[PDB]
């Protein structure tokens, strides 16, 4: 039974490409949102202390 | 909703903080002009009643 071999191999190559294209950019976008909201709350603290 | 509340509190904080900052100098000049008017009414009441002292002497 080598169908398992083909399927697992396909899963390996597609997760490789996932780590090549998708997850870098989506992590970038979520980290950018995190950065923006953290900057907003930091400026909130700054406004409070001012 | 509370993130919106946070940003609204930030804008209102900065706004009324600048407001109180300006009101600081406002009340400062108010106190000083009150002091000036008090000081000039003083010494002028003195000038007046002193002139009256000389006119009665």
A19: tokens are: 């780590």
Alpha carbons B18 and B20: distance in angstroms, whole number: 6
Closest listed residue to residue A46, CA positions, set B35, B32, B17: B17
| Interface touch B7/A48, C-beta < 8 Å | no
Site from B6, B9, B11, B16 to mutate, A interface, most A CB atoms within 10 angstroms: B6
Reported resolution in A?
A: 2.8
User: What does B4-46 look like in DSSP terms, one character per residue?
Assistant: HHHHHHHHHHHHHHHHHHHHHHHHHHHHHHHHHHHHHHTTHHH
In angstroms, the separation between the Cα of residue B27 and the nearest Cα of chain A is 20
Site from B2, B4, B7 to mutate, A interface, most A CB atoms within 10 angstroms: B7
A41: tokens are: 């709350």
Backbone angles phi, psi at B42, to 5 degrees: -60, 155
């Amino acid at each position: 039974m080598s169908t398992f071999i083909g399927q697992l191999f396909g899963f390996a190559v597609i997760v490789y490409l996932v780590w090549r294209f998708i997850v870098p950019l989506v992590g970038r976008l979520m980290s950018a949102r995190q950065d923006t909201v953290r900057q907003q709350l930091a400026d909130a603290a700054a406004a409070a202390d001012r | 909703r509370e993130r919106d509340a946070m940003v609204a509190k930030t804008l209102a904080d900065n706004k009324k903080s600048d407001e109180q900052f300006a009101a600081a100098q406002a009340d400062y000049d108010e106190a000083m002009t009150e002091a000036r008017v008090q000081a000039s009414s003083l010494r002028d009441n003195a000038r007046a009643d002193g002139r009256k002292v000389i006119e009665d002497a």
